[PDB]
């Protein structure tokens, strides 16, 4: 089919941006730790997640 | 002094998010599509009938010119 690959990898890029904003790594994140999470969300992340979703 | 400030949803929450499938029907019956196809076929048949009869007449005229010139 080969078109939806690009169509949806744009959205995958946006979610990689979310990952990078929350942890600094696009896809090898290591954000979720065995005590919780490493860091708190940045102040404008929830709004952008809502806009994306 | 200053109160806590962290990433939290705004008061009243966020607006609703659509998640259901949305595949609207454009709208045309199978009967309608078949009718359109047959109608264009009939129009083409009629126009071709007229044009080919005219072509037959023209060919006959050319053959008459040849026959006149033959001797």
Q: Provide the experimental method for this PDB entry.
A: cryo-EM
Cα dihedral value B58, B64, B69, B71, nearest 10? 160
Classified as helix, coil or strand, A8 is helix
Beta bridge partners of A36: A33
Q: How far is CA B20 from the centre of its chain?
A: 30
Nearest-neighbour CA in chain A from B13: distance (Å): 11
Helix axes A45-52, A4-23, angle to 10 degrees: 170
Residue B15's contacts (CB-CB under 8 Å, 6 or more residues apart) are A50
Q: Which of B4, B5, B6, B7 to mutate to test the interface with A (most CBs of A within 10 A)?
A: B7
Q: Are A18 and A49 in contact (CB under 8 A)?
A: yes
Nearest CA in chain A to B6: A43
End-to-end CA distance of chain A: 25
Q: Are A38 and A30 in contact (CB under 8 A)?
A: yes
Counting one residue from chain A and one from chain B, the pairs whose CB atoms sit within 8 A come to 17
Nearest-neighbour CA in chain B from A46: distance (Å): 7
C-alpha distances in angstroms, A50 versus A32, B1, B15? 21, 31, 9
Reference A45, options A27, A22, A28; nearest CA is A22
């Amino acid at each position: 089919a080969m078109t939806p690959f690009f169509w949806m990898f744009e959205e995958r890029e946006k979610m990689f941006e979310f990952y990078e904003r929350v942890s600094g790594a696009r896809m090898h994140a290591a954000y979720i730790r065995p005590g919780g999470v490493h860091q708190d969300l940045p102040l404008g992340l929830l709004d952008d997640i809502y806009e994306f979703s | 002094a200053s109160k806590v400030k962290q990433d939290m949803p705004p008061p009243g929450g966020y607006g609703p998010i659509d998640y259901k499938r949305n595949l609207p029907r454009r709208g045309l019956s199978g009967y309608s599509m078949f009718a359109v196809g047959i109608g264009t076929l009939l129009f083409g048949y009629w126009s071709m009938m007229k044009w080919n009869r005219e072509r037959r007449r023209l060919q006959i005229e050319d053959f008459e010119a040849r026959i006149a010139l033959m001797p």
